[PDB]
Amino acid sequence: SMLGERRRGLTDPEMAEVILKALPEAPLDGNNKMGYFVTPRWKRLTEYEALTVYAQPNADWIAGGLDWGDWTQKFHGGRPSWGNETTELRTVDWFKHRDPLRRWHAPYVKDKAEEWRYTDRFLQGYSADGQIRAMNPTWRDEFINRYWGAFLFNEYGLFNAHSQGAREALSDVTRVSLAFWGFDKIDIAQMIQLERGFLAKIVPGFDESTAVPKAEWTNGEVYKSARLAVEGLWQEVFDWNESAFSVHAVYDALFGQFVRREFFQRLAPRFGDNLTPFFINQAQTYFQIAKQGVQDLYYNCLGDDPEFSDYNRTVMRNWTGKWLEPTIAALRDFMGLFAKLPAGTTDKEEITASLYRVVDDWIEDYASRIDFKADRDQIVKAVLAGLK
Amino acid sequence: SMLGERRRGLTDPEMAEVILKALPEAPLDGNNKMGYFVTPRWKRLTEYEALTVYAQPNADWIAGGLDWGDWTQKFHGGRPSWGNETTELRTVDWFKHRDPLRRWHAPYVKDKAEEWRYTDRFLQGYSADGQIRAMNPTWRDEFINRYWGAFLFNEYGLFNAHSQGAREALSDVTRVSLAFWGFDKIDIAQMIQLERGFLAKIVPGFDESTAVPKAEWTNGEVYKSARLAVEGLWQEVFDWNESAFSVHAVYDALFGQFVRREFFQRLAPRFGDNLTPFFINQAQTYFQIAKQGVQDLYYNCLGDDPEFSDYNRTVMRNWTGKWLEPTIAALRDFMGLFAKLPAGTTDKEEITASLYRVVDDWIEDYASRIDFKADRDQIVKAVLAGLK
Amino acid sequence: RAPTSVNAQEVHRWLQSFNWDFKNNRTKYATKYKMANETKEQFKLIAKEYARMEAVKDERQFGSLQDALTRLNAGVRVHPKWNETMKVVSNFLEVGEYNAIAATGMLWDSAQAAEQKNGYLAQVLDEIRHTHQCAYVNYYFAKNGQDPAGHNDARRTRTIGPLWKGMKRVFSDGFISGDAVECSLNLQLVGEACFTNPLIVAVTEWAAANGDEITPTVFLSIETDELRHMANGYQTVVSIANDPASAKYLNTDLNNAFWTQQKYFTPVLGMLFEYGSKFKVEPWVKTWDRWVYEDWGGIWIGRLGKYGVESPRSLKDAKQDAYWAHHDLYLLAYALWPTGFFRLALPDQEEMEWFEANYPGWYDHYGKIYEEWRARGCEDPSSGFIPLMWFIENNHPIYIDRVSQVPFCPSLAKGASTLRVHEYNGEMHTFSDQWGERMWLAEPERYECQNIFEQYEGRELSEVIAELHGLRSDGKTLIAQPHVRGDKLWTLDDIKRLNCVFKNPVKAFN
Amino acid sequence: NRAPTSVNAQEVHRWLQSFNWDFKNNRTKYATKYKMANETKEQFKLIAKEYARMEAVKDERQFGSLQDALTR
Amino acid sequence: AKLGIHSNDTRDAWVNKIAQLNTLEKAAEMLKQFRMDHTTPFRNSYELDNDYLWIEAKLEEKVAVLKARAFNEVDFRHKTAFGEDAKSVLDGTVAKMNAAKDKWEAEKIHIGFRQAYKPPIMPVNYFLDGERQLGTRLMELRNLNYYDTPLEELRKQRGVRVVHLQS
Ligand SMILES: [Co+2]
Ligand SMILES: [Co+2]
């Protein structure tokens, strides 16, 4: 029928009057601010904070928890649903972390959605504008298809490295940040394949199969150490903070940045490739967004913890040393790719200069924050040994 | 108060009861589709058409109008609010046009808003990522600032050429498209300045003032014929259709496309500049968006008018010729810019290939639609006759 | 040179190939099962497209909430009882959503096929959205509602009461502690499929009937995502069906999961629905039988028979103890009203008729009891009476099930009246059924949750409430109330005057 | 430093006035008895992008309420 | 006195006690003792039932801080707070678990492993790798023919003292 059979209490005269009659003359409490008991990071409590902080039902025995008592059901053997035992790092309060971009779910999918729709528009405009005509065939068919492609597996592995953290993170703010860092990594892997699928639609004979870039990843030399490092970071690390920290503040900060920014972003334009840089732009935006969260959690909150600052820095310095070597090996093997380029593309000086940019950025944004004594020239020298 | 003093018919028991009592048992007409009488361009009528077609109160004496009688108030002298006398082109129905992208206000601002927010995110990532470190200092301080900047006035002038069309358009569907074509143009001009404003923030010494780029536009030599072409299309043309057609199917399709796509979008990447291309990606996405609209109006509707096809093609071929000259002149003057480029940037072989791309895309996308006999070789030859 | 692009499906076509082999490529969690690495997922999504479809839903949802609904004063024009019910409904569901984030992160880790990992990944992201959505409902009612207390701090005031403990078992620890597959069962195969999804729809129904258009707006949106979550539960079973271990353990983990979920929701949902509303939608009895017995334990569970799945062996008992479950529990929840973060009301005259009508015998048992508590002045702050006292006077001890955390009073209950008391290595343990007892006997170390009587033992009631911040902004009036009227609200002092001191009922045993 | 940096509408609008240049036919195409000063300022310092965004936000709520709650 | 859920005399008493643990060996030994005395269904006593979880965490914080200061980087990653080789301990325990004849034997192995090596005693990476392997075996043994033993017999197997029954 036009009116329907279901009567609603907000509009149904009879029911609404019943409801209105039972109502108080005014609210039974003037404090209408959900999450008012949360210590605000900024001037005033944010929606991000209100909707997120303390969602995790931790008891006081897990630093910062407001509940009490043991979990109702634990693992066979006795392991707690969440516990201090899942990470070496300690803190006065696991709920102190704040994503500087204040991303709760709504804002997060909103921005990515905008990026998705614009990407589609960009591609339709790119194809319709025939800009592919000026792209060097060799750069396109060998470096984008094979080498940029193989990098999707690196990003895919870093994505998977986050699986355990999604399960073990000791707070809501940290779980949400981690989830988003991981989600952005798989997005990039998918955007690399997206570009390959696109090229296959506008370039006759371009095979979008992942077989070639996957064989490069699993059996080539250029990415051998990178893959070895990724397999370790992902499956050999059972500590959710060692995983996130080592991925974002060591491996991806050095190797990741070098490959994306100092190789592809830097060289693609030289071969008439404005296509790959469109996607790398997204990756770097994501990288810089995650960096703010990574720094807030590991340096602002943990490395600067009023009670465990010294302890956490010792641990993180430990992790940095542990993962720096595998990361250098990864960069060293990657140096082999430069020999595959057409003569005159770049030279040792440019490569070295670009290595230093990555290393210097890493020392300023990460190493120095925990007093890790990194020697810029020693690191670069070790990597350069890989130049074939 | 908690309940407020205002009583609402939808929720107030007393008022709602009265309202429900007056309601019929079922709708008084089963035809619940607004714009049902509109002739669908596609399979089923779209929201775009429903909300747009026939909003303009034209009477039957203006091809397509559904109203009757003269206008209630006219200009001193007798000129009608809207009349056949404002354009040389004739048609069986001015409401035939359909933006292929079906853009009414909502979708339009949604897309540009996504582009705006992503642009902001991009800039924050770009700066934080220090990608400016690898950009050629001369390209930035001379070609981006002065020459790219000066181009903003070209786009700006093209934006303004749409002012009269905004007033004289003979239908809603045409008025909306026109408004969007012009708005995208000023957007581009503002994006050019945005970049210069961005550079000024991350590159000390960089002056965002329009003084330099303006003087180049007003008194320079590179864009002289370009500016002359603009001033004429804008302030010397009084036929709204000639203006739209000449600006989009002639001038901007040749000169504009060359400058944006074949010069900056093509060369910026060679100087480690992925910044400018980020903005040209927009300008080109927009250009390609507008093109579908321009093609549907002048070719699909007017050029192929079941009764004035022949007549309109004549008028457009006439316009094509009238403006093909000032355009070529604009292109010749632009050639002088290559001479200012550092040695080795590009060779005459590449340029000839770029010109033919523009000229050929133009013939395929515009000139051939109205049976305009263009000579690719003669045009390219004429333009090239202006190199260093 | 025609406008071309790439969609999600076109990229997803190659997603299964993203994973590669290496010696240590294996789940980090303990499990009796092996998920096939060839397992596929139902929805061919990629991160970008997932975000877009969810953003579109948010748009409509927040648009309604912030504009039309706010203009209509929808946050206020809701029945008082229901404003209280949603404090519990929205916040308790929130933790379920939250723990499902970790739970699915664990399943993502368990899965070896890239597509199956991807399926779980989308749920991880969805449960984050749902957490924020449930948070938003409490957030909205606190900001624009008739009583913000409880809605504004449930995340900490929920810790005072016994009802919260059981919620954590089925929607927190049950979702993440144990064999990944066992967790999947509690979460997807049983939790969402049998109760959550049906519950979500039902809640929007009861909400609309009580003037609440806020919850329908959010929950109906949550519901659109749960369709995909079902496929994750189904694919879990599929990914392990061909593994010999499956025949050995699947039905046991499933049966345990079913009992776990049922044990808490059978009584709690019915209680919030029938006692937390003015306008009723349907008797819990028939709703339960349709959900659990008809739709789930018959239709849904049956379709999985081809994978070895059988109907829960404990399904019969579940049905037997179901009938009076929620009624037995409200007596306890109301008797312990000072420990909640919401206001409760005695059934009114009209309601007792509905109850007696839909549950022959209700009046002679519960009806009379409430009338006496009413007579004793349970609603009046000057009465110096709390229903708990009545239980003490009439020697009706309230115990807490060591496993499920569900409170029970076997000496009064009309439903299950079984009580098992064991002493083990210096500690007493109380169970209310043979399934939970079995769980504890076989897995003592999994169930060590201390109950409210153990923690509050020897503590004066007002001190516990004050310590755990169970007060309103005035710092004197209690959040919880024995009535939903706007006047004569109990204060901490009214409670202190009662001099109620908790004691652990199991200590009576020798 | 590499601090996250961007540019807003006001920052671009500041130079909007200079976007127009002097020339030949630079005048209205419509009959009028008045002369609008070419130095006139506008109150809202907007650019196409920001305009689009502020309106998109309003559309969001509006259509959201219409298609969802109001229809329900 | 001073009672309370989150703050009480017992907790204060342990904070003072912990404050005097200033060498790794002494602190680590006390944490291990604490776990034997107050955790799991096999704890030596239930006297600290309401505060042990919290006190254990505070004890853990101290052992961790002391270990980080005393151990070189290699040992912090690979040795237990007691100087044992983490891998050896892990492998040996897993080997023991795989030899377990039944679920009763297996539960003792798993539970005792936790009591003795829970971080910060054993490095987190090895401990959770242990949880992974030991938990799998424990569950495999326990979930086999789960309902075959009647409650009357299971109570006897668990060895509980049936205090009161009613039905
Ligand atoms: Co959910
Ligand atoms: Co779900």
Swiss-Prot record, chains A, B:
The GO annotation for biological process reads: one-carbon metabolic process
* Gene3D superfamilies recorded: Ribonucleotide Reductase, subunit A
InterPro entries (alphabetical): Ferritin-like_SF, MethMoxA_beta, MP_mOase_hydro, Phenol_Hydrox, RNR-like
The molecular function terms in GO held by this entry are: methane monooxygenase [NAD(P)H] activity
Spell out where the chain crosses the membrane: none
Superkingdom classification of source? Bacteria
Mind telling me which Pfam families this protein's record contains? Answer: Phenol_Hydrox
Record keywords: Monooxygenase, NADP, One-carbon metabolism, Oxidoreductase
- Subunit notes for this chain? M.capsulatus has two forms of methane monooxygenase, a soluble and a membrane-bound type. The soluble type consists of four components (A to D): protein A, comprising three chains, in an alpha-2, beta-2, gamma-2 configuration, is a nonheme iron protein containing an unusual mu-hydroxo bridge structure at its active site and interacts with both oxygen and methane.
- What does this protein do, in the record's words? Responsible for the initial oxygenation of methane to methanol in methanotrophs. It also catalyzes the monohydroxylation of a variety of unactivated alkenes, alicyclic, aromatic and heterocyclic compounds.
NCBIfam families assigned to the protein according to its UniProt record, in alphabetical order? MethMoxAlphaMmoY
What name does the UniProt record give this protein? Answer: Methane monooxygenase component A beta chain
Q: Which organism is it from?
A: Methylococcus capsulatus (strain ATCC 33009 / NCIMB 11132 / Bath)
Give the gene that encodes this protein.
Answer: mmoY
From Swiss-Prot, chain D:
> What is the top-level taxon of the source organism?
Bacteria
Taking the record's annotation, the residue ranges forming a coiled coil are none
The record describes its quaternary structure and partners as: M.capsulatus has two forms of methane monooxygenase, a soluble and a membrane-bound type. The soluble type consists of four components (A to D): protein A, comprising three chains, in an alpha-2, beta-2, gamma-2 configuration, is a nonheme iron protein containing an unusual mu-hydroxo bridge structure at its active site and interacts with both oxygen and methane.
| Protein family (similarity comment) | Belongs to the TmoA/XamoA family.
Q: What does this protein do?
A: Responsible for the initial oxygenation of methane to methanol in methanotrophs. It also catalyzes the monohydroxylation of a variety of unactivated alkenes, alicyclic, aromatic and heterocyclic compounds.
Q: What is this protein called?
A: Methane monooxygenase component A alpha chain
* Source organism (scientific name): Methylococcus capsulatus (strain ATCC 33009 / NCIMB 11132 / Bath)
* The organism's taxonomic lineage, starting at the top: Bacteria, Pseudomonadati, Pseudomonadota, Gammaproteobacteria, Methylococcales
UniProtKB/Swiss-Prot annotation, chain E:
Q: Name one Pfam family in it.
A: MeMO_Hyd_G
One of the GO biological process terms: one-carbon metabolic process
Q: Which reaction does it catalyse?
A: methane + NADH + O2 + H(+) = methanol + NAD(+) + H2O; methane + NADPH + O2 + H(+) = methanol + NADP(+) + H2O
Top class in the EC scheme: oxidoreductase
InterPro entries xrefs: Me_mOase_g (IPR004222), Me_mOase_g_dom1 (IPR015952), Me_mOase_g_dom2 (IPR015953), Me_mOase_sf_g (IPR036123), MethMoxGammaMmoZ (IPR054953)
Q: Name one GO molecular function term.
A: methane monooxygenase [NAD(P)H] activity
Q: What is the E.C. number? A: 1.14.13.25
Q: How does it assemble?
A: M.capsulatus has two forms of methane monooxygenase, a soluble and a membrane-bound type. The soluble type consists of four components (A to D): protein A, comprising three chains, in an alpha-2, beta-2, gamma-2 configuration, is a nonheme iron protein containing an unusual mu-hydroxo bridge structure at its active site and interacts with both oxygen and methane.
**Role, per record:** Responsible for the initial oxygenation of methane to methanol in methanotrophs. It also catalyzes the monohydroxylation of a variety of unactivated alkenes, alicyclic, aromatic and heterocyclic compounds.
Alphabetically sorted, this entry's keywords are: Monooxygenase, NADP, One-carbon metabolism, Oxidoreductase
Q: Which gene encodes it?
A: mmoZ
Q: What is the protein name stated in its UniProt record? A: Methane monooxygenase component A gamma chain
